[PDB]
Design an enzyme around this catalytic site. Structure first.
Site, short mmCIF file in Angstrom:
data_model
loop_
_atom_site.label_atom_id
_atom_site.label_comp_id
_atom_site.label_asym_id
_atom_site.label_seq_id
_atom_site.Cartn_x
_atom_site.Cartn_y
_atom_site.Cartn_z
N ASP A 1 -12.69 -3.02 6.17
CA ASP A 1 -11.73 -3.52 6.77
C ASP A 1 -11.44 -3.70 8.21
OD1 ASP A 1 -12.38 -0.40 6.31
OD2 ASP A 1 -10.13 0.00 7.83
N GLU B 1 -7.84 -5.75 5.62
CA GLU B 1 -9.25 -5.86 4.21
C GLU B 1 -9.73 -6.94 4.32
OE1 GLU B 1 -10.40 -3.83 2.68
OE2 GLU B 1 -10.47 -4.16 0.94
N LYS C 1 -12.39 -8.97 2.09
CA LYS C 1 -13.16 -9.26 1.07
C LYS C 1 -14.05 -10.39 1.01
CE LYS C 1 -11.60 -5.79 -1.33
NZ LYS C 1 -12.22 -5.05 -2.25
#
Lengths: 156, 156
Positions: free
Chosen positions: A57, A67, A69
DNA sequence: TGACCAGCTGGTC
DNA sequence: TGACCAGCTGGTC
Protein backbone atom coordinates in the site's frame (compact mmCIF):
# COMPACT_ATOMS: atom_id res chain seq x y z
CA UNK A 1 29.05 -24.31 -10.85
CA UNK A 2 27.26 -23.52 -14.13
CA UNK A 3 29.13 -21.55 -16.91
CA UNK A 4 26.61 -18.64 -16.88
CA UNK A 5 27.76 -17.65 -13.35
CA UNK A 6 30.31 -15.58 -15.29
CA UNK A 7 27.56 -13.35 -16.85
CA UNK A 8 25.92 -12.89 -13.44
CA UNK A 9 29.19 -11.36 -12.22
CA UNK A 10 29.46 -8.68 -14.94
CA UNK A 11 25.82 -7.65 -14.38
CA UNK A 12 25.88 -7.39 -10.57
CA UNK A 13 27.23 -3.83 -10.07
CA UNK A 14 24.32 -2.51 -12.17
CA UNK A 15 21.81 -4.60 -10.14
CA UNK A 16 23.31 -3.10 -6.90
CA UNK A 17 22.77 0.45 -8.24
CA UNK A 18 19.10 -0.42 -8.84
CA UNK A 19 18.70 -1.82 -5.30
CA UNK A 20 20.32 1.43 -3.98
CA UNK A 21 17.68 3.47 -5.82
CA UNK A 22 14.92 1.25 -4.36
CA UNK A 23 16.26 1.76 -0.80
CA UNK A 24 16.25 5.55 -1.36
CA UNK A 25 12.51 5.18 -2.00
CA UNK A 26 11.68 2.76 0.84
CA UNK A 27 11.87 -0.68 -0.80
CA UNK A 28 14.25 -3.07 1.06
CA UNK A 29 14.30 -6.06 -1.33
CA UNK A 30 13.68 -5.72 -5.08
CA UNK A 31 13.47 -9.54 -5.32
CA UNK A 32 10.29 -10.10 -3.22
CA UNK A 33 6.64 -9.05 -3.62
CA UNK A 34 7.19 -7.46 -7.07
CA UNK A 35 9.65 -5.02 -5.39
CA UNK A 36 11.59 -3.99 -8.49
CA UNK A 37 8.27 -3.45 -10.33
CA UNK A 38 6.72 -1.46 -7.49
CA UNK A 39 9.55 1.15 -7.80
CA UNK A 40 8.60 1.87 -11.46
CA UNK A 41 4.95 2.48 -10.57
CA UNK A 42 5.93 4.77 -7.66
CA UNK A 43 8.33 6.94 -9.70
CA UNK A 44 5.82 7.23 -12.63
CA UNK A 45 2.81 8.19 -10.43
CA UNK A 46 4.59 10.14 -7.67
CA UNK A 47 3.10 7.87 -4.95
CA UNK A 48 5.10 6.80 -1.82
CA UNK A 49 5.42 3.59 0.29
CA UNK A 50 5.70 4.52 4.02
CA UNK A 51 7.90 2.76 6.63
CA UNK A 52 5.85 0.37 8.74
CA UNK A 53 3.24 -0.20 6.00
CA UNK A 54 1.50 -3.61 6.04
CA UNK A 55 1.86 -4.60 2.37
CA UNK A 56 2.29 -2.90 -1.00
CA UNK A 57 0.00 0.00 0.00
CA UNK A 58 1.04 3.61 -0.86
CA UNK A 59 -0.08 7.24 -0.33
CA UNK A 60 -0.21 10.49 -2.35
CA UNK A 61 0.80 14.10 -1.48
CA UNK A 62 -2.38 14.56 0.56
CA UNK A 63 -2.03 11.36 2.56
CA UNK A 64 -4.73 9.29 0.80
CA UNK A 65 -3.98 5.49 0.83
CA UNK A 66 -4.10 3.14 -2.19
CA UNK A 67 -3.80 -0.68 -2.65
CA UNK A 68 -1.28 -1.58 -5.42
CA UNK A 69 -1.56 -4.81 -7.46
CA UNK A 70 0.56 -6.12 -10.35
CA UNK A 71 0.20 -8.77 -13.08
CA UNK A 72 2.35 -10.55 -15.68
CA UNK A 73 0.04 -10.98 -18.70
CA UNK A 74 2.46 -13.28 -20.52
CA UNK A 75 1.35 -15.83 -17.88
CA UNK A 76 -2.11 -14.95 -16.54
CA UNK A 77 -5.26 -12.85 -17.15
CA UNK A 78 -6.52 -12.40 -13.57
CA UNK A 79 -5.09 -10.31 -10.65
CA UNK A 80 -4.45 -12.17 -7.32
CA UNK A 81 -6.11 -10.93 -4.11
CA UNK A 82 -5.82 -12.95 -0.83
CA UNK A 83 -5.12 -16.71 -0.13
CA UNK A 84 -7.71 -16.63 2.73
CA UNK A 85 -10.45 -14.12 1.71
CA UNK A 86 -13.24 -13.28 4.22
CA UNK A 87 -15.22 -10.19 5.44
CA UNK A 88 -12.38 -8.89 7.66
CA UNK A 89 -9.99 -8.83 4.65
CA UNK A 90 -12.64 -7.14 2.44
CA UNK A 91 -13.11 -4.37 5.11
CA UNK A 92 -9.44 -3.45 4.70
CA UNK A 93 -10.16 -3.01 0.95
CA UNK A 94 -13.49 -1.12 0.91
CA UNK A 95 -12.53 2.52 1.43
CA UNK A 96 -9.41 2.92 -0.70
CA UNK A 97 -9.00 3.25 -4.46
CA UNK A 98 -6.80 0.62 -6.22
CA UNK A 99 -3.86 1.08 -8.68
CA UNK A 100 -3.44 -1.86 -11.15
CA UNK A 101 -0.19 -2.19 -13.14
CA UNK A 102 0.05 -4.41 -16.26
CA UNK A 103 3.32 -6.07 -17.35
CA UNK A 104 4.67 -8.24 -20.15
CA UNK A 105 7.15 -10.17 -18.03
CA UNK A 106 9.24 -7.19 -16.95
CA UNK A 107 8.26 -4.40 -19.36
CA UNK A 108 5.45 -2.19 -17.99
CA UNK A 109 2.61 -1.56 -20.47
CA UNK A 110 -0.11 0.38 -18.60
CA UNK A 111 -1.51 1.58 -15.25
CA UNK A 112 -5.20 1.99 -14.28
CA UNK A 113 -6.96 3.55 -11.26
CA UNK A 114 -10.23 2.08 -9.85
CA UNK A 115 -12.44 3.78 -7.21
CA UNK A 116 -14.42 1.99 -4.43
CA UNK A 117 -17.69 2.29 -6.45
CA UNK A 118 -16.14 0.30 -9.30
CA UNK A 119 -15.00 -2.58 -7.06
CA UNK A 120 -18.31 -3.17 -5.14
CA UNK A 121 -19.35 -5.83 -7.69
CA UNK A 122 -16.49 -8.04 -6.46
CA UNK A 123 -16.81 -7.24 -2.73
CA UNK A 124 -20.50 -8.33 -2.92
CA UNK A 125 -19.73 -11.51 -4.92
CA UNK A 126 -17.09 -12.62 -2.39
CA UNK A 127 -19.24 -12.00 0.68
CA UNK A 128 -22.12 -13.92 -0.92
CA UNK A 129 -19.95 -16.99 -1.55
CA UNK A 130 -18.40 -16.91 1.92
CA UNK A 131 -21.84 -17.22 3.50
CA UNK A 132 -23.04 -19.92 1.06
CA UNK A 133 -20.09 -22.18 1.79
CA UNK A 134 -20.55 -22.17 5.58
CA UNK A 135 -18.02 -19.44 6.42
CA UNK A 136 -15.18 -21.08 4.49
CA UNK A 137 -12.35 -18.68 3.45
CA UNK A 138 -12.08 -18.23 -0.36
CA UNK A 139 -8.73 -19.31 -1.87
CA UNK A 140 -7.41 -16.39 -3.99
CA UNK A 141 -10.38 -15.37 -6.19
CA UNK A 142 -9.28 -13.23 -9.22
CA UNK A 143 -10.14 -9.79 -10.73
CA UNK A 144 -10.08 -10.09 -14.60
CA UNK A 145 -7.73 -7.79 -16.54
CA UNK A 146 -10.56 -6.95 -18.97
CA UNK A 147 -12.79 -5.72 -16.10
CA UNK A 148 -9.92 -3.45 -14.92
CA UNK A 149 -9.31 -2.01 -18.41
CA UNK A 150 -13.01 -1.34 -19.07
CA UNK A 151 -14.07 0.10 -15.69
CA UNK A 152 -10.91 1.98 -14.65
CA UNK A 153 -9.31 5.31 -15.71
CA UNK A 154 -5.98 4.85 -17.56
CA UNK A 155 -3.20 7.02 -16.01
CA UNK A 156 -0.21 5.64 -17.98
CA UNK B 1 6.42 11.69 -11.89
CA UNK B 2 9.35 11.72 -9.45
CA UNK B 3 12.51 13.18 -11.04
CA UNK B 4 14.46 9.97 -10.21
CA UNK B 5 12.58 8.29 -13.11
CA UNK B 6 15.35 9.43 -15.47
CA UNK B 7 17.83 7.30 -13.49
CA UNK B 8 15.79 4.13 -13.79
CA UNK B 9 15.89 4.64 -17.58
CA UNK B 10 19.69 4.40 -17.68
CA UNK B 11 19.61 1.27 -15.49
CA UNK B 12 16.74 -0.60 -17.18
CA UNK B 13 18.60 -2.19 -20.14
CA UNK B 14 20.90 -4.01 -17.68
CA UNK B 15 17.97 -5.19 -15.58
CA UNK B 16 16.24 -6.62 -18.65
CA UNK B 17 19.42 -8.65 -19.49
CA UNK B 18 19.33 -10.24 -16.04
CA UNK B 19 15.64 -11.27 -16.50
CA UNK B 20 16.58 -12.75 -19.92
CA UNK B 21 19.24 -14.89 -18.19
CA UNK B 22 16.77 -16.11 -15.53
CA UNK B 23 14.20 -17.10 -18.19
CA UNK B 24 16.82 -19.34 -19.87
CA UNK B 25 17.28 -21.17 -16.55
CA UNK B 26 13.57 -21.69 -15.84
CA UNK B 27 12.72 -18.60 -13.75
CA UNK B 28 9.86 -16.41 -15.15
CA UNK B 29 10.05 -13.38 -12.81
CA UNK B 30 13.16 -12.11 -11.02
CA UNK B 31 10.98 -9.85 -8.81
CA UNK B 32 8.93 -12.55 -6.97
CA UNK B 33 9.88 -15.48 -4.72
CA UNK B 34 13.48 -14.30 -4.30
CA UNK B 35 13.78 -15.03 -8.05
CA UNK B 36 16.93 -13.00 -8.68
CA UNK B 37 18.63 -14.63 -5.67
CA UNK B 38 17.40 -18.17 -6.42
CA UNK B 39 19.12 -17.91 -9.85
CA UNK B 40 22.42 -17.05 -8.13
CA UNK B 41 22.17 -20.18 -5.88
CA UNK B 42 21.31 -22.41 -8.84
CA UNK B 43 24.32 -21.12 -10.80
CA UNK B 44 26.73 -21.60 -7.88
CA UNK B 45 25.54 -25.14 -6.93
CA UNK B 46 24.76 -26.61 -10.35
CA UNK B 47 21.16 -27.47 -9.35
CA UNK B 48 18.34 -27.04 -11.91
CA UNK B 49 14.60 -26.24 -11.48
CA UNK B 50 12.16 -28.96 -12.59
CA UNK B 51 9.42 -27.61 -14.86
CA UNK B 52 5.95 -28.29 -13.43
CA UNK B 53 7.41 -27.75 -9.94
CA UNK B 54 5.69 -26.49 -6.81
CA UNK B 55 7.58 -23.36 -5.68
CA UNK B 56 11.39 -23.18 -5.43
CA UNK B 57 12.24 -26.96 -5.41
CA UNK B 58 15.28 -28.07 -7.47
CA UNK B 59 16.92 -31.30 -8.70
CA UNK B 60 20.48 -32.66 -9.02
CA UNK B 61 21.95 -34.84 -11.82
CA UNK B 62 20.90 -37.91 -9.87
CA UNK B 63 17.26 -36.84 -9.83
CA UNK B 64 17.16 -36.07 -6.09
CA UNK B 65 14.79 -33.23 -5.15
CA UNK B 66 15.60 -30.44 -2.68
CA UNK B 67 13.72 -27.60 -0.88
CA UNK B 68 15.56 -24.24 -1.14
CA UNK B 69 15.40 -21.38 1.44
CA UNK B 70 16.96 -17.87 1.64
CA UNK B 71 17.50 -15.07 4.21
CA UNK B 72 18.98 -11.49 4.54
CA UNK B 73 20.97 -11.62 7.80
CA UNK B 74 21.20 -7.84 8.18
CA UNK B 75 17.46 -7.70 8.97
CA UNK B 76 16.03 -11.22 9.59
CA UNK B 77 17.27 -14.03 11.92
CA UNK B 78 14.95 -17.00 11.20
CA UNK B 79 14.12 -18.91 7.96
CA UNK B 80 10.41 -19.02 6.92
CA UNK B 81 8.62 -22.37 6.45
CA UNK B 82 4.82 -22.60 5.75
CA UNK B 83 1.88 -20.25 6.62
CA UNK B 84 -0.31 -23.33 7.48
CA UNK B 85 2.06 -26.03 8.92
CA UNK B 86 0.29 -29.45 9.38
CA UNK B 87 0.80 -33.31 9.03
CA UNK B 88 0.36 -33.24 5.22
CA UNK B 89 3.08 -30.53 4.83
CA UNK B 90 5.39 -32.32 7.32
CA UNK B 91 5.20 -35.62 5.39
CA UNK B 92 6.31 -33.75 2.21
CA UNK B 93 9.26 -32.09 4.04
CA UNK B 94 10.51 -35.43 5.48
CA UNK B 95 11.30 -36.78 2.00
CA UNK B 96 14.03 -34.33 0.87
CA UNK B 97 17.27 -32.60 2.01
CA UNK B 98 17.18 -28.75 2.34
CA UNK B 99 19.55 -26.04 0.89
CA UNK B 100 19.84 -22.78 2.95
CA UNK B 101 21.33 -19.55 1.48
CA UNK B 102 22.58 -16.62 3.64
CA UNK B 103 22.79 -12.98 2.36
CA UNK B 104 23.87 -9.60 3.86
CA UNK B 105 22.06 -7.05 1.68
CA UNK B 106 22.02 -8.66 -1.76
CA UNK B 107 25.56 -9.92 -1.19
CA UNK B 108 25.70 -13.71 -0.69
CA UNK B 109 27.73 -14.93 2.29
CA UNK B 110 27.26 -18.74 2.54
CA UNK B 111 25.18 -21.86 1.63
CA UNK B 112 24.44 -24.91 3.90
CA UNK B 113 22.81 -28.32 3.31
CA UNK B 114 20.87 -30.40 5.93
CA UNK B 115 19.60 -34.00 5.58
CA UNK B 116 16.15 -35.23 6.81
CA UNK B 117 17.70 -36.73 10.00
CA UNK B 118 19.17 -33.24 10.79
CA UNK B 119 15.68 -31.58 10.76
CA UNK B 120 13.63 -34.29 12.54
CA UNK B 121 14.12 -32.33 15.81
CA UNK B 122 11.67 -29.73 14.38
CA UNK B 123 9.31 -32.13 12.48
CA UNK B 124 8.75 -34.22 15.63
CA UNK B 125 8.18 -31.04 17.66
CA UNK B 126 5.71 -29.50 15.15
CA UNK B 127 3.66 -32.70 14.62
CA UNK B 128 3.23 -33.24 18.40
CA UNK B 129 2.11 -29.60 18.78
CA UNK B 130 -0.45 -29.87 15.93
CA UNK B 131 -2.32 -32.82 17.56
CA UNK B 132 -1.92 -31.47 21.09
CA UNK B 133 -3.36 -28.04 20.15
CA UNK B 134 -6.48 -29.77 18.92
CA UNK B 135 -5.63 -30.08 15.22
CA UNK B 136 -4.59 -26.44 14.72
CA UNK B 137 -2.19 -25.30 11.95
CA UNK B 138 1.04 -23.52 13.02
CA UNK B 139 1.60 -20.08 11.38
CA UNK B 140 5.13 -19.94 9.90
CA UNK B 141 7.39 -21.25 12.70
CA UNK B 142 11.06 -20.28 12.02
CA UNK B 143 14.32 -22.28 11.78
CA UNK B 144 17.14 -20.33 13.59
CA UNK B 145 20.26 -19.41 11.54
CA UNK B 146 22.34 -20.69 14.49
CA UNK B 147 20.72 -24.16 14.15
CA UNK B 148 21.46 -24.31 10.41
CA UNK B 149 25.12 -23.34 10.85
CA UNK B 150 25.63 -25.91 13.62
CA UNK B 151 23.82 -28.93 12.15
CA UNK B 152 24.47 -28.60 8.43
CA UNK B 153 27.32 -29.08 5.96
CA UNK B 154 28.81 -25.83 4.55
CA UNK B 155 28.59 -25.98 0.70
CA UNK B 156 29.69 -22.38 -0.16
C1' DT C 1 -15.53 -15.67 -16.71
C1' DG C 2 -14.47 -18.53 -12.15
C1' DA C 3 -14.21 -23.65 -10.22
C1' DC C 4 -10.73 -26.51 -7.90
C1' DC C 5 -5.72 -26.45 -6.05
C1' DA C 6 -0.63 -24.71 -4.50
C1' DG C 7 4.31 -22.01 -2.37
C1' DC C 8 7.33 -17.51 -1.60
C1' DT C 9 8.17 -14.84 2.80
C1' DG C 10 8.32 -10.42 6.56
C1' DG C 11 7.29 -8.69 11.55
C1' DT C 12 6.76 -8.38 17.14
C1' DC C 13 7.59 -9.87 22.02
C1' DT D 1 14.32 -19.76 21.96
C1' DG D 2 9.18 -20.37 20.19
C1' DA D 3 4.42 -18.78 19.54
C1' DC D 4 2.10 -15.87 17.49
C1' DC D 5 0.89 -11.58 14.12
C1' DA D 6 0.62 -10.35 8.82
C1' DG D 7 0.83 -9.89 2.68
C1' DC D 8 2.98 -10.97 -2.26
C1' DT D 9 1.38 -14.15 -5.97
C1' DG D 10 1.07 -18.60 -9.36
C1' DG D 11 -0.92 -23.85 -11.55
C1' DT D 12 -4.91 -26.88 -14.38
C1' DC D 13 -9.31 -26.62 -17.00
Amino acid sequence: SHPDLNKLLELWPHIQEYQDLALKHGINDIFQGNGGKLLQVLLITGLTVLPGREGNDAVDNAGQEYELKSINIDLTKGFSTHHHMNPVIIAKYRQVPWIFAIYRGIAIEAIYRLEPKDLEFYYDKWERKWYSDGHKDINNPKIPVKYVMEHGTKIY
